[PDB]
A paper describes a structure:
The hypothetical protein ORF6 of the Enc34 phage is conserved among all Nazgul-like phages and consists of a single domain, currently annotated as a domain of an unknown function DUF2815. Here, we present structural and functional characterization of the Enc34 ORF6 that allows us to establish its function as a single-stranded DNA-binding protein (SSB) and extend this annotation to other DUF2815 family members. The SSBs are ubiquitous within all kingdoms of life and in DNA viruses, and protect ssDNA intermediates during replication, repair and recombination. In this study, we show that the Enc34 ORF6 is structurally homologous to the gene 2.5 protein from bacteriophage T7, and present a high-resolution structure of ORF6 in complex with ssDNA, which reveals for the first time the structural basis for the ssDNA-binding mechanism of T7-type SSBs.
In T7 gp2.523 and T4 gp32, the removal of the acidic C-terminus results in higher affinity for DNA, and to further test the DNA binding properties of the Enc34 ORF6, a recombinant protein ORF6ΔC was constructed with the C-terminal 21 residues lacking. While the ssDNA-binding affinity of the truncated protein remained unchanged (bottom left), somewhat surprisingly, a similar affinity was observed also for dsDNA (bottom right). While co-crystallization attempts using the full-length protein were unsuccessful, the truncated ORF6ΔC protein could be crystallized both in absence of DNA and in presence of oligo-thymidine (dT). ORF6ΔC crystals without bound DNA diffracted to a slightly higher resolution (1.34 Å) than those of the full-length protein and had three molecules in the asymmetric unit. Due to different packing of loops and N-termini in the crystal, the three protein chains have Cα RMSDs of 0.8 to 1.1 Å when superimposed with the full-length ORF6.
Author numbering: -1 to 37, 45 to 178
Amino acid sequence: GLAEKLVPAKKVKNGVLYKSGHIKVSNVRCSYPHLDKPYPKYSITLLMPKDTHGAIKKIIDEQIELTKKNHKTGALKVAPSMLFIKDGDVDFPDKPECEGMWVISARESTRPDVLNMEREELESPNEIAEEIYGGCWVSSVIRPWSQENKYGKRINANLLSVLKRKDDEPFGE
């Protein structure tokens, strides 16, 4: 799978930047998983605790700037509201699980690698949905991409892998 192919560039607390621009965010809480079947797109929201993910957030900001620079129509300007990463303490007032979190949204049209706690690829949609529920903790590999169309200018994140890390209280989404 993906993990065996990636070549690390920089490892920090709770994260890795790869030479290919992939970013691993480790030990984050998931929300709204759509890993079983597309919904077409697969998707997840990652709630990344600010106090333990500062360095990887800094790297994410840097990679967002690189992605703007290399957009296919030339350097792309994107407002903070149109990025895949948002501030849980400002942009999610009525969602308490977002307190003290960076909120990352990632999507893909093809299924990401989905690994259970034993680092085994899952295949059954029902098993995937049971294994990785909203509220559990995961680690995930994402990579930014730039978009410019009639609906706006965005920096999005491809969802490339999700690894189950720990059980916790379900959000019941």
